Design an enzyme around this catalytic site. Structure first.
Site, PDB file in Angstrom:
ATOM      1  N   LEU A 165      -7.971   5.494   6.318  1.00 31.86           N
ATOM      2  CA  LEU A 165      -8.956   6.637   6.126  1.00 31.86           C
ATOM      3  C   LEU A 165      -9.081   7.360   7.347  1.00 31.86           C
ATOM      4  O   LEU A 165      -8.574   7.209   8.148  1.00 31.86           O
ATOM      5  CB  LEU A 165     -10.301   5.968   5.737  1.00 31.86           C
ATOM      6  CG  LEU A 165     -11.491   6.746   5.000  1.00 31.86           C
ATOM      7  CD1 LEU A 165     -10.595   7.253   3.515  1.00 31.86           C
ATOM      8  CD2 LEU A 165     -12.552   6.155   4.946  1.00 31.86           C
ATOM      9  N   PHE A 197      -8.195  -5.493   3.122  1.00 27.93           N
ATOM     10  CA  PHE A 197      -7.564  -3.887   3.517  1.00 27.93           C
ATOM     11  C   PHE A 197      -7.958  -3.103   2.121  1.00 27.93           C
ATOM     12  O   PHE A 197      -8.722  -2.186   2.387  1.00 27.93           O
ATOM     13  CB  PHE A 197      -6.295  -3.907   3.623  1.00 27.93           C
ATOM     14  CG  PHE A 197      -5.874  -3.670   5.188  1.00 27.93           C
ATOM     15  CD1 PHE A 197      -5.951  -4.308   6.208  1.00 27.93           C
ATOM     16  CD2 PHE A 197      -5.328  -2.457   5.538  1.00 27.93           C
ATOM     17  CE1 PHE A 197      -6.030  -4.191   7.583  1.00 27.93           C
ATOM     18  CE2 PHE A 197      -4.781  -2.164   6.812  1.00 27.93           C
ATOM     19  CZ  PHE A 197      -5.329  -3.102   7.821  1.00 27.93           C
ATOM     20  N   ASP A 229      -6.517   9.911  -1.923  1.00 24.05           N
ATOM     21  CA  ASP A 229      -6.358   8.513  -2.709  1.00 24.05           C
ATOM     22  C   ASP A 229      -6.699   8.710  -3.901  1.00 24.05           C
ATOM     23  O   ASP A 229      -7.394   9.599  -4.417  1.00 24.05           O
ATOM     24  CB  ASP A 229      -6.733   7.403  -1.759  1.00 24.05           C
ATOM     25  CG  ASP A 229      -8.291   7.367  -1.439  1.00 24.05           C
ATOM     26  OD1 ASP A 229      -8.871   8.571  -1.555  1.00 24.05           O
ATOM     27  OD2 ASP A 229      -8.986   6.461  -1.437  1.00 24.05           O
ATOM     28  N   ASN A 259      -7.481 -18.532 -10.213  1.00 23.53           N
ATOM     29  CA  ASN A 259      -8.907 -17.901 -10.008  1.00 23.53           C
ATOM     30  C   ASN A 259      -8.673 -16.391  -9.596  1.00 23.53           C
ATOM     31  O   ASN A 259      -9.505 -15.532 -10.048  1.00 23.53           O
ATOM     32  CB  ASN A 259      -9.748 -18.608  -9.114  1.00 23.53           C
ATOM     33  CG  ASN A 259     -10.603 -19.604  -9.666  1.00 23.53           C
ATOM     34  OD1 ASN A 259     -11.826 -19.951  -9.529  1.00 23.53           O
ATOM     35  ND2 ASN A 259      -9.734 -20.422 -10.745  1.00 23.53           N
ATOM     36  N   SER A 284     -12.498 -19.196  -5.161  1.00 24.40           N
ATOM     37  CA  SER A 284     -11.186 -19.096  -4.507  1.00 24.40           C
ATOM     38  C   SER A 284     -11.137 -19.562  -3.007  1.00 24.40           C
ATOM     39  O   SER A 284     -10.238 -20.226  -2.604  1.00 24.40           O
ATOM     40  CB  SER A 284     -10.571 -17.750  -4.628  1.00 24.40           C
ATOM     41  OG  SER A 284     -10.165 -17.274  -6.186  1.00 24.40           O
ATOM     42  N   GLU A 297       0.714  -1.087   0.200  1.00 25.25           N
ATOM     43  CA  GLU A 297       0.065   0.033   0.045  1.00 25.25           C
ATOM     44  C   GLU A 297       0.793   1.243  -0.086  1.00 25.25           C
ATOM     45  O   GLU A 297       0.637   2.338  -0.677  1.00 25.25           O
ATOM     46  CB  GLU A 297      -0.807  -0.027   1.342  1.00 25.25           C
ATOM     47  CG  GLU A 297      -1.727   1.383   1.213  1.00 25.25           C
ATOM     48  CD  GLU A 297      -2.462   1.629   0.185  1.00 25.25           C
ATOM     49  OE1 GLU A 297      -2.916   0.723  -0.479  1.00 25.25           O
ATOM     50  OE2 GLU A 297      -2.866   2.782   0.012  1.00 25.25           O
TER      51      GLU A 297
END
Lengths: 789, 833
Positions: free
Chosen positions: B31, B103, B19, B131, B116, B10
């Protein structure tokens, strides 16, 4: 002569007027003799002596009486003396006056003045009385009661007894007291002690012998005893006389000149006493050994010098002149000059500073004594000199025994009253004899009195003297309220010049001179000071409540603290200036200072020292040229120093520069640091002395120049054991240095008294000339002082 | 692990930023607020962080904001029925991989993955990755997604490995793009910009141009000049050799490689370059440690000046080389390794990559702890106690202005010594420590270069401070750089202007008052014109060589100094002596006197005896009367003209006092561990004051009441040398010794008197023996017993001496021998002439 002849024979107007009346009779009678035809040829034939004898006859009897003598005048004219005298002796004239006639008759026979005897002469004596009656006998054998009344011999015995009772104790006590007390034995008193010994010789040698003879009425001891008595009597009187002469000389020189106090040691005093004895023996001895003679005088009891009988065998004329001129006139002139100049100096000095009341009391007491000294001297010796003079001028007249006794009264009385004035009235001897007669009786710092009532405080001893203003004395005084109650405490500043011993000088006549003295009150004050110093504030806070301040200032006309160095053998000699701060308590008002209650007073000495100033003077550079008697060539010399002000223990380079253009050779070049000791008290008296000296062996040739620089180091250590060297004032017997160069303020009013000092470099050239050595020399001044700390 | 994963993916932004969506977000995707207001974001930020952030937060605070998201997201996972069983089934590593998906995309995005999450729950890894790779997420962020997808397959952090590991090297750069190649083969321009490789070439060129001449000249100048070759400079010479190894072995090789952009010499060349680079740095380090130790012991203790010969200096240089090889050799022989560091140009020690094959953990700890802490403790203690001693000593006598200038110059240098040491080694130690504590983090090539900059710079600026700023070496190099350039008695100066005169050399010291110096000085008016002549009294303590001691830090200590003026004087002298008067009359007009007095707190003239092999070693106290001319006022004593000055040494000698002290009679008893019987011993001498060359009869009396037998009785005349300069340091030594073979039986008494003759001749060829001060290399005698005045104010500095008779009884006790002994003091001094 003729006048003396008739005065003895025949016997209001004066005596001189009667002599003139007689001379008129002489003139008139001689004319009468020449008028008479019988008297003229006899007068012409006879000599001057027999002529006077004829005039004697013509005087009394007249021309009438003498004219009647036929046979005698014939025989007198024919040179027949005896039968003329026989005819005259058998006449009424011899019967009338056998005393007068017998003398004249003998004159006609002899033709000489042998008959004309005043008194009765002898081999070893002279009686002043006529032996015509036939009563005179020898004074060495028989009594002399025919001269005067027997009770007057008892008077002489009573008088001589009085002289022994008064004379012996006074003079013996003078010596006895001196043996006991150390205080008295000092060179100046040596001459006063000689006076006591002289008077003792008059008592033991003179009066006791005169007493023994006066009781009997004649001199029992004979010619030998008369010589010895007269010798001691003269010796005692003459030593006493010259003792007073020496005393006058001493007191003049010692007082007026303060430097001479050091000079006059024991050896100089011995010379004074020696001179006294020499002059005494110079006139006392010759009477024994031919020149004059000692014979019984007056009543033929006391023996003395023969000043009346003219005997050319022993030569009395020259002796009486010698005696009179020297022994009378010269002492009189010297003594009157001595004490005259003494009082002159003191009166002028006292008038110079009238502010000091102590000097006025001294000046008064001195002048009173000097008047008495003169009166005592005159009363003593004038009677002898006046009578001896009158006897010499009038020799033809006769003089009785009591007439000769009057001078003997006053002179022998001087044996008593001279000890009174010179010894008993002397202040020291009076207080010393008082003891003997009465059997033995009758950081800041401080100092406490003996009674411990008053206690003085001072910040420092050494007070500085700047040229403009002097640094004043500052301090306080602690007082006890209980002890000091109803009293006045005074703080006093004292500047004093000291010379000689304290007891000897104060007592004799006058004491040491104070240059400046200053009194100030303390407890209780009227209030004096404006504002107090830091010292006084600190002391007030430290000490208790009974502390009171004082501030004593110096004026601008005072000297510095300077003393003079004594020799090691000089045990009791000291002279020097010193300052003294003293505080004391008293009941009495302001003027009672000179005399002091001893117990309450407390004293602490200080100095007025001069440091060297910040400005150094100009670099000293002296220059001088010389010429000589034969060679007229110039000899130029130029001296130069490093500094104007040198300091103590500093090297002194003397850069001498000599340029020789003369024919002569120079032997050597000597440099010397000579200090001028200028002493001032009564009169200005300079005294130069060398201190340090160095000399080079180099020689300057003709037409040759030389430049040398010799260093000199003036120090006290090298100059020890020397008299007259001025030193800086010692505090209390501690080590010091050579005296500082004194500085005087410019254009002041009053003269500066005290010991002034100044140094100078004196170069001298020993010039080898043509046996004689020419010593040319020049000086340049400089200063020797302490540095500023 | 998980924190390092999301920080790399990130990206950790410290300040507030908008962002891709355009919302106020802080930290690692944390945030703040949905509102368009920035202060609304600040409101929740300030409350969450707990202070006035103003948008700016620390990296650790962003980590805590992240940990709150980790906690909140994990709670959200467990709330969801589809995500909870998958989270429970997977291990900690794959759980962190799931959290990464939760996240960014949120619970919403991850909840959509049906196939998955079924296969992940069923332990099918490959088809799950197939997948996940076929989704929008891989299309969105293939950089981030590819790393996470590989993590799910492997179950290890291999995708999240910071740099690219290798057999003989470690590149701090990702090989995910596929650009990393061997530093021993291909160029390394992908690490940093090509111009920074030219910068490294220019930098290494600068180090060679500055480094080689300075250090080579240091040695070259030493070969020429004899003055420099002294034991203390031996360690400074070792520092020069160490820095030369860094130039020839290190920088020249680094220069060649920096030009090409990669290490051309291979693993063999990297080992040898890194070996010499480490060896040069470590010998330089331990040289400064030894230098600090030397300067502390030699200056503070004056006796150690004698001790420090060539052999002790060699041991210091040997120890330096041993400690250097102790840490330089193991990297070659297994413990740690030499690899290309930073830009893969310079080779150095591996302190970043944790490789348990070579054991870097234990090595980095061993090196860091030992080589950082031991110099830090020793050097700060050495120079710290040195300045402590000098400042206290300077305060002891503030009257001496010369000591104050020294103390100032010293303190200034010591501050610079510390600054130079810290600037050198702290960057390496701090970065190595930070790398060890934060191992999960990434570190770039330029980051590793920053410590290398300061450490290799020390190769230059250490010679500047330790050699160039050194006073002797500065003046010696000045010569080389500029081609060779840049009865009464007296003593005349060299210029023959001033001429001093003195009455005698030997001045007497009475206990109450000291006999003062007295004399004069002749001066030339023409030569000395508009100048100031001073006569000066100086008392001085001397230790070590004259040139070397001024250079190290501070110079020899003067016990007492007093100057006095002469020409022209303030006034004159108060009163003159017989000597001064005599000299003034003998000499010319230009002669000026002087009187110099001694105070009551000074020592006597005492020196210490050197060995015959000690050619260049001297220590001793001596007095010096000196006269000189100068243009400058009073305080200009510190410097003087060599030509005008004239010096003549003197002594403050103590004669024996007229009245002898009490007859010495010591007495002492003893006991033992088993036998409680007493052993009474009593000693007695003839005199309190013995003289030089006098017999010393020691009448020993021993009364034995114990069970034990005594082996022998030995007597010894011991000289106590009490040396005081900075601190009170006693030094005991025997002078004469005699022993009897007789034995004292149980319950038996003995009275014997042994004579001892202390002489200099028998005590020759011995170090530390105190002697009376020599005038000019002449024969002397044993040092006199020093006397101190009663109840004085100030402390007596200098060499104090005292003698004592020490009897010792070798007692044959229970093979083992007990040696009991007692002492009694006495004096050895000259007689009154």
């Amino acid at each position: 002569n003729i006048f003396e002849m008739l005065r003895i024979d025949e016997g209001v107007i004066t005596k001189d007027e009667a002599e003139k009346l007689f001379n008129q009779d002489v003139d008139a009678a001689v004319r009468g003799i020449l008028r008479n035809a019988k008297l003229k040829p006899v007068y012409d034939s006879l000599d001057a002596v027999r002529r006077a004898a004829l005039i004697n006859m013509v005087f009394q009897m007249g021309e009438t009486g003498v004219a009647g003598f036929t046979n005698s005048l014939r025989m007198l004219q024919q040179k027949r003396w005896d039968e003329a005298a026989v005819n005259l002796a058998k006449s009424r004239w011899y019967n009338q006056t056998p005393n007068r006639a017998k003398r004249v008759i003998t004159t006609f026979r002899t033709g000489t003045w042998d008959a004309y005897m005043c008194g009765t002469e002898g081999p070893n004596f002279y009686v002043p009385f006529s032996n015509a009656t036939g009563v005179v006998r020898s004074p060495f054998e028989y009594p002399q009661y025919y001269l005067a009344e027997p009770w007057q011999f008892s008077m002489l015995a009573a008088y001589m007894f009085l002289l022994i009772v008064l004379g012996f104790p006074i003079n013996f006590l003078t010596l006895y007291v001196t043996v006991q007390h150390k205080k008295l034995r000092t060179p100046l008193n040596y001459i006063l002690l000689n006076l006591a010994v002289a008077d003792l010789f008059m008592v033991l040698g003179g009066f006791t012998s005169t007493l023994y003879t006066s009781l009997h009425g004649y001199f029992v001891f004979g010619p030998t005893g008369c010589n010895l008595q007269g010798f001691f009597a003269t010796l005692g009187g003459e030593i006493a006389l010259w003792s007073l002469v020496v005393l006058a000389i001493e007191r003049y020189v010692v007082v007026c000149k303060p430097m001479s106090n050091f000079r006059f040691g024991e050896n100089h005093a011995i010379m004074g006493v020696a001179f006294t004895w020499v002059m005494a023996l110079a006139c006392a001895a010759p009477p024994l050994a031919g020149w004059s003679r000692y014979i019984p005088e007056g009543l033929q009891c006391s023996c003395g010098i023969d000043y009346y009988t003219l005997k050319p065998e022993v030569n009395n004329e020259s002796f009486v002149i010698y005696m009179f001129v020297v022994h009378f006139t010269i002492p009189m002139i010297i003594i009157f000059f001595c004490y005259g100049q003494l009082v002159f100096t003191v009166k002028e000095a006292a008038a110079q500073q009238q502010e000091s009341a102590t000097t006025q009391k001294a000046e008064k007491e001195v002048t009173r004594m000097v008047i008495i000294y003169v009166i005592a001297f005159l009363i003593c010796w004038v009677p002898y000199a006046s009578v001896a003079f009158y006897i010499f001028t009038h020799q033809g007249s006769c003089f009785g025994p009591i007439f000769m006794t009057i001078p003997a009264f006053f002179a022998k009385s001087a044996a008593i009253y001279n000890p009174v004035i010179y010894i008993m009235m002397n202040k020291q001897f009076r207080n010393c004899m008082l003891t003997t007669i009465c059997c033995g009786k009758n950081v800041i710092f401080k100092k406490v009195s003996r009674d411990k009532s008053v206690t003085i405080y001072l910040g420092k001893r050494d007070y500085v003297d700047h040229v403009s203003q002097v640094e004043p004395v500052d301090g306080v005084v602690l007082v006890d309220p209980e002890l000091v109650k109803g009293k006045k405490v005074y703080v006093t500043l004292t500047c004093a010049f000291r010379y000689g011993q304290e007891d000897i000088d104060v007592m004799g006549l006058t004491f040491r001179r104070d240059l400046y003295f200053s009194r100030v009150q303390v407890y209780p004050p009227v209030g004096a000071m404006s504002v107090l110093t830091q010292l006084q504030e600190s002391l007030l806070k430290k000490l208790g409540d009974n502390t009171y301040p004082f501030l004593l200032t110096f004026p601008d006309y005072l000297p510095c603290s300077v003393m003079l160095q004594p020799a090691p053998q000089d045990v009791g000699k000291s002279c020097g200036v010193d300052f003294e701060v003293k505080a004391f308590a008293s009941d009495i008002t302001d003027p009672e200072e000179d005399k002091i209650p001893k117990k309450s007073s407390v004293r602490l000495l200080i100095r007025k020292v001069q440091h060297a100033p910040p400005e150094m003077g100009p670099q000293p550079s002296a220059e001088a040229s010389w010429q000589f008697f034969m060679s007229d060539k110039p000899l130029n010399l130029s001296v130069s120093l490093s500094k104007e002000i040198y300091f103590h223990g500093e090297p002194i380079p003397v850069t001498v520069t000599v340029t020789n253009n003369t024919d002569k050779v120079v032997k050597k070049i000597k440099v010397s640091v000579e200090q001028i000791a200028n002493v001032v008290l009564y009169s200005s008296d300079y005294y130069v002395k060398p201190v340090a000296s160095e000399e080079t062996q180099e020689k300057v040739q003709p037409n040759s120049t030389l430049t040398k620089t010799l260093v000199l180091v003036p120090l006290l250590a090298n100059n020890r054991e020397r008299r007259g060297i001025a030193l800086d004032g010692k505090i209390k017997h501690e080590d010091t240095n050579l005296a500082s160069s004194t500085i005087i303020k410019e254009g002041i009013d009053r003269t500066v008294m005290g010991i002034l000092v100044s140094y100078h470099i004196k170069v001298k050239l020993t010039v080898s000339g043509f046996l004689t050595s020419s010593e040319v020399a020049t000086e340049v001044p400089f200063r020797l002082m302490h540095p500023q700390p």
